[PDB]
Amino acid sequence: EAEQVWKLWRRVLRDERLQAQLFSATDATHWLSGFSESESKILSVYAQQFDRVKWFVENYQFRLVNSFLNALETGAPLSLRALLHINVDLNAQSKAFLRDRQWRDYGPQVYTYCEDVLGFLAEADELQGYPEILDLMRLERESVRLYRGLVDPESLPADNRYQRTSMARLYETRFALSGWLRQKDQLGLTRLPESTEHVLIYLPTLQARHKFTLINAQAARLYNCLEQPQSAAGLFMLINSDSASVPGSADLALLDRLEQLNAIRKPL
Amino acid sequence: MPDFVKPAPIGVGIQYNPEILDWFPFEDIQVDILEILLDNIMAPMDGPQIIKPSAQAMIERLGQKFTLLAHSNYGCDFGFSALEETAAVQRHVPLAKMLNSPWVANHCFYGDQSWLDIWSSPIQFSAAEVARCADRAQSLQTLYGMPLAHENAAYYLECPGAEMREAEFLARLVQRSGTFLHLDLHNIYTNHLNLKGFDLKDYMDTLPLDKVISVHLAGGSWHGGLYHDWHDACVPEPVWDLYEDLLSRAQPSAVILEYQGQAHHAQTRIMDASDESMIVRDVQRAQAIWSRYNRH
């Protein structure tokens, strides 16, 4: 038997709970159960070693339960500390995630692993309380999407328009998450005032660790009004109530802070 | 002459665990090598980074005092996907060059559905696999830019479709590929203890021992209910015997011992003054055997 159909036979085996139960329950004359001719041929090779085969499945399922935690530390490290502080049953959530996700092995794709996990935990009933922890996970999800967006990062126009860079994203919070960002020991444990805070996630250089810094409302509106590459007049007409087409009091200063934070590109 | 040759012997080294450096007696015990797991310092493949920024700061401190060896485990070196799409080419080949590793180490398993310590799955010992993997090994060694060695694995069940002995697969693979070998003597002893018909003499006779650039001496791993880890999770004397035989029949470039994280436990703190001290006691013995067979 070509070994590719051997590995191809294990992934479906290692990813289906029902088919794995059929091995321990019965080995039958009528084509086993739910297995093809060649698949049964490869299976009959393990007919004597059924007990150790079950050990491999249990060991495989156990590593994916621990791959879940490493993803949460690679992306969303703060959210992991918050879940650890409030003692959410991560082993149960990891099994719930993988079973719902058909026991997928994300492998080297850790940010895709982390982004999907933060989406699963956002809908988890155990976490429907603690509203601030949900806010932290959404912020860290934007940090995950920032890393994912720098793979094949679209393209650089380098035009004469105020334009965004792929090395920054903005997340408007529902709570004052900045309190947790400074004293990480209070993650998850304390309660936060419901204040909208504009947290810009950015990488100063492509090889560096991302950082969180807060920008003001006008700085956020400039970033929002640069959602698509907009001309000098377009950016100032959109944000200003007068549609004056000239930079307001704060705009030219904040557009400088945004460039220093590797968030925008000035026209040139 | 083959564009890749076995480097001059470096000496005895250990695998890198954050704990060992805290207590290891440097300035008393000469250690100039450190095995760095490339998958432990690699940044995600769905991200734009090669090395995780935290690990990059650690790498440079270690590089000053020690020579850093690269170990690739879960990179799909011998998988069915195209080599250029594997973790080895994308995130492991560049990391070894960051370490300036003298050579790289590979594992002869399939990265998917395999855990190095507890549960592994072997490569099919067949003629098609000798051809398929050596073509990948030759191509991967060219990309790495340094001698690539493949580590023999310990398996509890043999892959269906076996056509040859494990040593002959490794022997025919390295001849066709031109790559080298990283011998985990514990895995040979484990297979001899558990697997039926495993001939330790045939394994060492069949192998091209002149292609062994590195050796792996490891304490007893801890698999649940396996007879291994018999007295303690330290390098067993049968493994020590193969180390002497390996140096009596060939000259490797280096030997690596491993902390292996959690391995042995006791009701008292530990069944010695320090198993961490046993690490000292094992390194000294390996240094003696190395110097006893020093070819200068």
CATH number, domain containing residue A242: 3.90.930
- Please give the Cα distance from B100 to A72 (Å, whole number): 30
Interface of B with A in 24-43 (CB under 8 A): 42
DSSP string, chain A: --HHHHHHHHHHHHT-HHHHHHHHH---TTTTTT--HHHHHHHHTTSTTHHHHHHHHHHHHHHHHHHHHHHHHHS-HHHHHHHHHTT--HHHHHHHHHHHTTT---TT-HHHHHHHHHHHHHH-GGGSS-HHHHHHHHHHHHHHHHHHHTSS-------SSBEE-TTEEEEE-SS-THHHHH-GGGTTTS-------EEEEE-SSTTSPPEEEEE-HHHHHHHHHTSS-B-HHHHHHHHSTT--SS--TTHHHHHHHHHHTT-EE---
A7, A148, A206 ranked by CB distance to B110: nearest? A7
Residue recorded with tokens 């035989």: B245
Alpha carbon distances (Å) from B70 to A205, A207, B73, B217:
26, 21, 10, 16
Q: Given an 8 Å threshold on Cβ–Cβ distance, is B119 in contact with A107?
A: no
Cβ contacts below 8 Å, chain A against chain B, sum to 98
Q: Is B184 annotated as a binding residue?
A: yes
Q: Given an 8 Å threshold on Cβ–Cβ distance, is B157 in contact with A148?
A: no
Biggest CA-to-CA distance, chain A: 83
Is A262 a member of any domain? yes
With beta carbons less than 8 A apart as the criterion, state whether B204 and B245 touch. yes
Is A202 a member of any domain? yes
The residue segments making up the domain with residue A228 are 156-268
Q: Given an 8 Å threshold on Cβ–Cβ distance, is A151 in contact with B118?
A: no
DSSP string, B61-91: HHHHHSEEEEE--SS-TTSSS-GGGSHIIII
N-to-C CA span, chain B:
22
Task: Quote the Cα angle for B204-B210-B211, to 5°.
Answer: 95
Task: Quote the Cα angle for B160-A42-B77, to 5°.
Answer: 50
Residue A207, both tokens: 């090889």
Nearest residue to B121 via CA among A61, A110, A6: A6
Query: By CB neighbour count within 10 A (0-12 exposed, 13-18 middle, 19+ buried), where does B12 fall?
Result: buried
- Please give the Cα distance from B72 to B17 (Å, whole number): 16
Give the resolution to one decimal, in Å.
3.4
Q: Given an 8 Å threshold on Cβ–Cβ distance, is B123 in contact with A3?
A: yes
CA of residue B123 relative to chain centroid, distance: 16
Full set of structural domains in chain B with CATH: 11-293 (3.20.20.150)
Residue B213's SS3 state is strand
The shortest C-alpha distance from B101 to chain A (Å) reads 21
Q: Does B123 touch chain A (CB under 8 A)?
A: yes
Residue recorded with tokens 């580590």: B151
B53, B115, B159 ranked by CB distance to A207: nearest? B53
Is A221 a member of any domain? yes
A11, A111, A153 ranked by CB distance to B44: nearest? A111
Q: Given an 8 Å threshold on Cβ–Cβ distance, is A147 in contact with B121?
A: no
- Please give the Cα distance from B148 to B177 (Å, whole number): 10
Is A212 a member of any domain? yes
Q: Given an 8 Å threshold on Cβ–Cβ distance, is B159 in contact with A207?
A: no
Cβ-Cβ contacts under 8 Å, B47 against chain A: 110-111, 147-148, 150-151
Count: domains in chain A: 1
Q: Is B223 annotated as a binding residue?
A: no
- Please give the Cα distance from B170 to B168 (Å, whole number): 5
Is A148 a member of any domain? no
Q: Where are the beta strands (DSSP E) in chain B?
A: 11-15, 33-37, 67-71, 104-107, 148-151, 180-184, 212-218, 254-258
Residue B234, both tokens: 């330290």
- Please give the Cα distance from B252 to B213 (Å, whole number): 5
Q: Does B112 touch chain A (CB under 8 A)?
A: yes
**Number of residues assigned to chain A:** 268
Q: Given an 8 Å threshold on Cβ–Cβ distance, is B53 in contact with A59?
A: no
Is A266 a member of any domain? yes
Q: Is B92 annotated as a binding residue?
A: no
CA of residue A74 relative to chain centroid, distance: 10
Residue B136, both tokens: 């990948």
Alpha carbon distances (Å) from A65 to A61, A264, B268:
7, 39, 31
With beta carbons less than 8 A apart as the criterion, state whether B217 and B186 touch. yes
DSSP B190: H
- Please give the Cα distance from B170 to B206 (Å, whole number): 9
Beta bridge partners of B255: B12, B215
Q: Is B40 annotated as a binding residue?
A: no
User: What are φ and ψ of residue B70, in 5° steps?
Assistant: -105, 135
Is A115 a member of any domain? no
Residues 6+ apart with CB under 8 A from B203: B165, B166, B167, B188
Residue B25's SS3 state is coil
Helix orientation angle between A251-260 and A217-225, rounded to the nearest 10 degrees:
80
Task: Quote the Cα angle for A39-A41-A47, to 5°.
Answer: 105
The shortest C-alpha distance from A149 to chain B (Å) reads 8
Q: Given an 8 Å threshold on Cβ–Cβ distance, is B44 in contact with A108?
A: yes
- Please give the Cα distance from B35 to A79 (Å, whole number): 32
- Please give the Cα distance from B101 to B123 (Å, whole number): 26
Count CB-CB contacts under 10 A for residue B279.
Answer: 22
